[PDB]
């Protein structure tokens, strides 16, 4: 049988032309080949996973195809047919990578939420039961769990809870005062509620992506200045209890991750660091100590808290450490190796193409944003209507991947005694690439009325597929089986100091939209942490 | 674009022929017309929210619905393949034709070749082994109540996505009692806050089970002392104590939930779990009169609990021909379910028969015979899915295929009778004619005979259910109207022996349920629109042989 999908004529024409240009195997590589054949898909699938996976996966080609089409329509409406055509061509041939493409015309990527609207209003967007604002710890924890479950299904990416412990403390104290618990059973009641939360957030084939952030004293003071709990108390008056509550959780998981063997929430510590020292050295020494066991907390370093006290400021990171009330509605990544391949070694041409493609990506992000707005107006994204997800606090994200491979193809990498590295010219070249992307991102605000950011994305699948497409198009000229999601590859034989220095040079140019992975005593570890923080690295972890 | 789905030639031929013979409209009615067009489907979906507001769902609903036409089409194809393998091409073609034109109704059709319909579980494996079919986190057997509750919740969520229908937990309170007592003994709770700790876990459980568009369908059963003693004779808790030694603790805990739910159902307005009380009733009286009077009392407020009446506990004793009640609304016995329901469109046969009852019965027998084969095919497919490791509920002994019926469903008994000229109106309201009652008897007895033969024919047990048919009642009527026009005057077919809305004396309604509930072994429900008054009426209904009923308010 053949089934009719009812596209506009011009889109049909476009897809026919692209098919003729690139062949069926490009489409197959893009996930628009056999994958759209339900019988093949189903019979192949049915040969760790169970049936629940099937119903999730079966529709992904189809909702991708619809999303591509819808984005094309909106781009045509906004900028004209040629632009829309060019974007579709770029997405299908792999010059760019639309993330969560099966969701791109239906819902947004991620957000790091505050729990205040929950505490104050409960969960009125759910009708199957009425949920009065909580008044005890058990209710609060339930509500939080349900909120996470609901948000994971209203979005494609991470659910961040950086101020979780702030609001948890309040219900701990309130419960304590009203004698719901015996004091001698406080810690048991706390750890119980940790267990309930942690257990519920590690349930399926894979768990939703959540983030916790250990806020230091500076961040707590800065974020919640003036703000009050429900009882009228000032939040800033309980900084030491909130800290105490966070440390308890951190200690608890390090013991418990052995036993119960869970991943989430992904843990980040946010520390204000200036002039060679931590402004909250206690918290820093605590995290440094805790991490000794598993190295399970990511180090977030900042030199300022102005961002967290219409152009958007605040850190956005797909792994963790996204600031409170910050996110991204969509990421679209630039294939930098493609551009290298298209440039033929000419760096001027490289930068002209880069610039042009980043400009296209902005137009697509704008179009996606308009579609999200359409979804909101259609009553489909209640997290917006209920002011939990804020569109004015979401970036459009320009992604980058394959910086190293791109530089390599340009002949700007080498190897000396200290292993693999960029050449001097290669460092200048990366400087220029990143400065160009920055320039365009910054122009974006005035151009389209919302803020753009940049991230060196994890690219778990993109790093493979973009490489495959480039190999398909450029053959032996593209030697890499996979593109890199760090400034210098994880597997690379290179001195740790170079790695660190690169991160110290380039992390700032993406405003912390990157991570550094670095593979006998506390003071040693802490000396290293300080050394890395001194060099300007904004987000890192040891393995 | 035109997208290829890779069917065998015979199936494509068949579908094209059916298309030529019935027209696109029938396919559109069946869910295989414009619904397969992702663009039309999506464009449609995103403005229903606009129409909603004009008249008076969110994006999470989109990803659920978009694939249903497609997984139904695959399921139909797969069932056709398996039926061709098992019984030959003519049968398979016949079944596909019947399914598409509305002679039968395949339930959960978008799931039918992928997972089973329903089960009423025991929580013993969860208590003893935890949730080892989940890998995202380790889940050792619970030691405390809070953990037990969490595990039950996650089990429900997990099982709800491994099946299409209800998740029944008949012995929930049996196992919850244990953890309550255990935490009381070890001083986890202060005695003086014991009731508070319990209600907190009633809250947690109940919140979570009413908290998705629509919540998973769950069932609770108040087991009377007879059921508890009969089911759990010889069984022990993890501490080695006999469960039967705790009958009065289990009862008290069950009454506590029923009381709390009644008080709380108003405040929070939730629906689940669906409450049934299972009561042993013999020769004019409740064998557990205490529990019956309690239920009677607590129902005075919302009538939120359904009455399950049985004359025997033999079936449920210890829990190869399968015995035990199966009901899609509530009251399925412990360790009972159905892997699939396929309903016979009885009005269709009325229309086909032209008024002749022997023709009617010949066609019916043939249809039920075909349905049996379809159910046998679906069963084999589920077994394939099990061997492919896709249905861990079976691998971990929570879902039991040998404890699952293949279900022959029925809908439109009344409308079928009316089309046949076998209904009327007398002084006590609408009713069957004398000949109509015999006709209904013959229908049910014929299905019964075929069901009983099926066991020898196919090696598993068949049951019968007068299904709720929330959608089938409309679609079947519509299709019949499309095929037969004004000879099918009903906008909707009925899911009770007598239409809920019909002006007919309660006594007749009761009488009909008393005549026919047993023929479908309790696969039906009777809705009927001071305390002693209520109790007397309950007893009057039970004496008449009604097996499952409720009052509406």
């Amino acid at each position: 049988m053949k089934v009719q999908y009812s596209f506009e004529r011009e889109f049909e024409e476009l897809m026919s032309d692209l098919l003729s240009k690139y062949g069926y195997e490009m489409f197959q590589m893009d996930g628009l080949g056999d994958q759209l054949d339900v019988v093949k898909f189903t019979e192949d699938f049915v040969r760790v996973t169970n049936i629940s996976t099937y119903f999730i996966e079966i529709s992904k080609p189809h909702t991708y195809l619809y999303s591509l089409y819808r984005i094309w329509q909106k781009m045509k409406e906004m900028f004209g047919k040629g632009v829309a055509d060019e974007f579709v061509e770029a997405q299908i041939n792999g010059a760019v990578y639309l993330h969560d493409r099966h969701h791109a015309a239906l819902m947004p990527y991620c957000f790091a939420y505050t729990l205040k609207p929950i505490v104050e209003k409960g969960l009125p967007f759910i009708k199957t039961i009425k949920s009065e604002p909580a008044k005890h710890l058990s209710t609060f924890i339930q509500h939080v769990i349900q909120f996470v479950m609901f948000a994971s299904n209203q979005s494609s990416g991470a659910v961040g809870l950086p101020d979780f412990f702030v609001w948890m403390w309040y219900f701990v104290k309130k419960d304590l005062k009203e004698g719901i618990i015996p004091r001698d059973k406080l810690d048991w009641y706390i750890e119980q509620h940790f267990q309930i939360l942690t257990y519920s957030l590690n349930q399926p084939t894979q768990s939703p992506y959540t983030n916790f952030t250990y806020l230091d004293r500076n961040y707590i003071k800065a974020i919640f200045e003036g703000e009050r709990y429900p009882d009228g108390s000032l939040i800033t008056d309980h900084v030491e209890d909130i800290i105490a509550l966070q440390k308890h959780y951190w200690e608890w998981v390090s013991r418990e991750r052995e036993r119960q063997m869970f991943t989430f929430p992904v843990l980040t510590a946010s520390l204000l660091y200036k002039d060679g020292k931590f402004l909250d050295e206690d918290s820093a020494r605590f995290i440094n100590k805790i991490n000794m066991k598993w190295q399970d907390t990511n180090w977030y370093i900042s030199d300022s808290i102005d961002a967290v006290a219409e152009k958007l400021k605040g850190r956005m990171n797909s792994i963790g450490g996204s600031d409170l009330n910050i996110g991204s509605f969509k990421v679209i990544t630039v294939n930098l190796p493609r551009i290298a391949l298209e440039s033929g070694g000419d760096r001027e041409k490289y930068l002209q193409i880069l610039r042009h493609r980043v400009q296209l990506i902005k137009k697509a992000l704008a179009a996606v944003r308009e579609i999200i707005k359409e979804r909101i107006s259609e009553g489909l994204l209640p997290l917006y209507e209920n002011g939990l997800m804020l569109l004015n606090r979401q970036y459009g994200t320009i992604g980058v991947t394959g910086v190293w491979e791109s530089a390599s193809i340009m002949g700007l990498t080498t190897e000396d005694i200290d292993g693999l590295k960029y050449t001097e010219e290669g460092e200048v070249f990366v400087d220029n690439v990143l400065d160009t992307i920055r320039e365009e991102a910054e122009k974006g605000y005035h151009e389209y009325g919302f803020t753009f950011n940049i991230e060196q994305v994890p690219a778990e699948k993109a790093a493979v597929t973009l490489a495959q497409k480039d190999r398909f198009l450029f053959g032996e000229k593209q030697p890499f089986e996979i593109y890199s999601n760090q400034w210098v590859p994880l597997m690379a034989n290179t001195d740790v100091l170079n790695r660190i220095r690169y991160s110290g040079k380039w992390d700032k140019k993406v405003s912390g939209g990157a991570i550094l992975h670095i593979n006998k005593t506390e003071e040693e570890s802490f000396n290293m942490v300080k050394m890395i923080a001194d060099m300007g690295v904004m987000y890192f972890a040891f393995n």
Side-chain angles (χ1 to χ4, degrees), chain A:
Chain A
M1 218 209 279
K2 298 177 76 70
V3 186
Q4 188 63 255
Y5 295 170
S6 301
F7 298 118
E8 283 188 48
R9 176 174 174 161
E10 288 170 322
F11 186 74
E12 262 158 29
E13 286 173 14
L14 177 64
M15 301 299 289
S16 187
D17 292 320
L18 295 175
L19 188 47
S20 275
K21 181 166 178 180
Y22 294 107
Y24 198 84
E25 47 270 69
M26 180 62 60
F27 277 69
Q28 184 71 33
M29 276 185 302
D30 193 51
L32 295 174
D34 287 1
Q35 300 92 337
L36 289 156
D37 191 320
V38 174
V39 187
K40 290 209 190 97
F41 184 106
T42 302
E43 290 302 338
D44 295 349
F45 177 95
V46 73
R47 319 306 168 165
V48 177
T49 51
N50 68 70
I51 193 66
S52 61
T53 302
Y54 162 82
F55 295 104
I56 298 300
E57 296 290 326
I58 187 65
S59 55
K60 284 191 180 177
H62 308 264
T63 58
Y64 170 33
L65 185 48
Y66 168 81
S67 287
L68 188 51
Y69 176 58
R70 188 63 188 101
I71 292 173
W72 176 88
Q73 292 182 314
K74 181 60 68 176
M75 287 185 86
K76 180 160 87 100
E77 180 185 356
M78 296 170 85
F79 310 113
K81 181 183 178 302
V83 171
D85 296 335
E86 182 180 354
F87 178 71
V88 170
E89 184 166 351
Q91 162 58 22
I92 285 166
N93 75 17
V96 308
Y97 191 95
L98 181 69
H99 293 270
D100 332 288
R101 61 197 194 270
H102 50 280
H103 290 159
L106 301 145
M107 60 184 190
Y109 174 50
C110 72
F111 204 76
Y113 302 86
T114 173
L115 290 173
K116 183 175 182 158
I118 305 303
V119 169
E120 294 188 336
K121 303 229 195 69
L123 300 168
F125 39 94
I126 296 176
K127 328 281 196 163
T128 52
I129 192 170
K130 278 191 293 299
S131 64
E132 168 176 3
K135 293 191 174 288
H136 300 113
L137 185 61
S138 207
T139 314
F140 167 83
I141 292 300
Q142 291 302 118
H143 285 191
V144 166
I145 288 170
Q146 259 64 62
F147 167 71
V148 166
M149 292 306 134
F150 189 83
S152 82
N153 274 305
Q154 295 284 316
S155 70
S156 304
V159 176
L161 300 171
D163 82 351
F164 173 70
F165 296 95
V166 176
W167 296 98
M168 187 182 175
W169 169 249
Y170 173 81
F171 286 99
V172 172
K173 197 229 176 82
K174 172 170 184 301
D175 272 29
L176 172 61
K177 296 206 82 173
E178 299 177 353
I180 283 122
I181 59 96
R183 183 62 178 79
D184 64 275
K185 285 196 194 314
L186 186 70
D187 280 31
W188 163 92
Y189 199 56
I190 300 296
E191 294 188 19
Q192 163 149 118
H193 275 84
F194 289 174
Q195 174 65 221
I196 290 174
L197 183 52
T198 296
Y199 174 77
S200 302
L201 297 197
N202 285 272
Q203 302 298 325
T205 295
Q206 211 193 329
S207 313
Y209 202 105
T210 47
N211 294 99
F212 274 169
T213 296
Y214 182 119
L215 301 173
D216 80 1
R217 297 173 163 93
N218 308 286
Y219 270 95
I220 299 175
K221 287 209 280 289
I223 295 161
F224 298 105
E225 195 189 358
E227 294 295 329
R228 292 170 195 280
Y229 285 133
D231 60 16
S233 62
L234 208 66
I235 298 169
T236 57
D237 290 341
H238 315 265
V239 167
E240 292 296 310
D241 284 313
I242 298 171
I243 292 292
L245 185 46
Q246 277 171 355
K247 294 186 170 188
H248 191 178
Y249 187 78
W250 250 254
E251 268 168 15
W252 181 79
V253 309
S254 190
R255 152 167 61 270
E256 217 66 35
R257 213 190 285 281
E258 253 170 323
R259 299 165 152 226
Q260 300 188 236
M261 291 291 255
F262 52 80
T263 304
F264 299 98
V266 173
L267 300 187
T268 295
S270 281
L271 294 144
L272 182 64
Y273 184 102
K274 257 202 290 279
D275 301 292
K277 66 180 250 294
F278 289 102
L279 277 61
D280 180 357
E281 213 173 275
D282 173 62
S283 299
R285 291 207 113 89
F286 174 78
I287 296 299
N288 186 79
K289 179 180 133 92
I290 298 295
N291 252 335
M292 298 293 298
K293 188 66 168 166
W294 296 117
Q295 294 295 354
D296 55 342
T297 298
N298 291 338
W299 288 96
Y300 165 122
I301 308 298
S302 181
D303 72 342
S304 171
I305 39 63
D306 315 344
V308 289
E310 202 189 46
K311 184 163 179 176
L312 188 59
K313 309 283 189 187
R315 193 175 310 190
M316 170 58 211
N317 191 299
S318 288
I319 293 179
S322 285
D323 285 326
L324 189 63
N325 255 322
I326 288 294
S328 154
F329 65 84
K330 182 58 58 189
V331 189
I332 301 175
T333 290
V334 199
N335 180 346
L336 292 173
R338 169 67 56 80
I339 297 172
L341 292 166
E342 294 175 316
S343 74
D346 182 336
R347 293 161 71 181
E348 327 311 338
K349 187 183 184 182
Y350 188 116
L351 292 172
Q352 281 169 21
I353 293 163
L354 173 63
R355 199 171 281 277
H356 178 64
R357 212 150 275 166
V358 170
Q359 284 171 9
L360 184 61
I361 287 172
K362 291 192 286 186
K363 291 172 188 172
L365 289 163
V368 171
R369 194 181 201 255
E370 290 298 301
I371 294 164
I372 297 298
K373 277 148 81 173
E374 278 179 356
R375 300 304 177 221
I376 300 169
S377 71
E378 286 160 350
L380 298 172
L381 300 176
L383 289 184
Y384 286 111
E385 294 179 72
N386 287 246
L388 271 160
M389 187 184 271
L390 307 171
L391 190 62
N392 57 329
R393 300 286 292 181
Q394 285 175 306
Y395 294 104
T397 305
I398 301 149
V400 299
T401 191
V403 175
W404 177 256
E405 288 78 27
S406 184
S408 302
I409 290 160
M410 299 296 283
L412 300 164
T413 52
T414 190
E415 167 167 286
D416 70 350
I417 179 163
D418 294 336
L420 290 171
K421 60 178 61 170
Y422 290 93
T423 60
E424 177 260 335
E425 297 91 334
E427 297 190 9
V428 178
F429 179 73
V430 174
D431 286 338
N432 290 342
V433 171
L434 291 178
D435 284 348
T436 297
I437 300 173
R438 286 181 69 192
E439 288 180 56
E440 291 300 325
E442 295 293 342
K443 279 150 59 175
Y445 177 56
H446 303 100
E447 288 176 340
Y448 302 109
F450 65 94
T451 304
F452 295 76
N453 75 309
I454 310 171
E455 179 174 18
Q456 188 173 39
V457 294
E460 283 168 49
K461 295 187 173 178
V464 175
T465 59
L466 294 182
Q468 286 179 1
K469 287 180 174 194
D470 290 340
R471 178 86 184 177
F472 179 66
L473 293 174
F474 288 93
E476 274 187 343
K477 294 191 293 202
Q478 204 300 82
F480 298 97
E481 288 193 12
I482 190 169
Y483 293 161
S484 285
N485 59 12
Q486 283 194 89
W487 302 124
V488 55
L490 188 54
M491 278 257 294
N493 195 336
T494 173
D495 195 276
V496 60
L497 285 159
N498 298 130
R499 221 182 266 280
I500 295 164
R501 183 171 68 87
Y502 294 138
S503 297
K505 284 184 63 142
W506 297 330
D507 276 5
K508 58 177 70 162
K509 289 187 181 295
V510 293
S511 298
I515 193 171
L516 176 63
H517 285 122
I518 301 160
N519 296 16
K520 300 304 190 78
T521 58
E522 295 179 57
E523 193 56 27
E524 188 180 60
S525 169
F526 205 52
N527 289 344
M528 264 269 265
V529 171
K530 281 186 284 165
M531 181 273 170
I532 293 165
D534 276 343
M535 295 294 296
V537 184
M538 290 172 85
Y539 196 59
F540 61 99
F542 312 95
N543 301 14

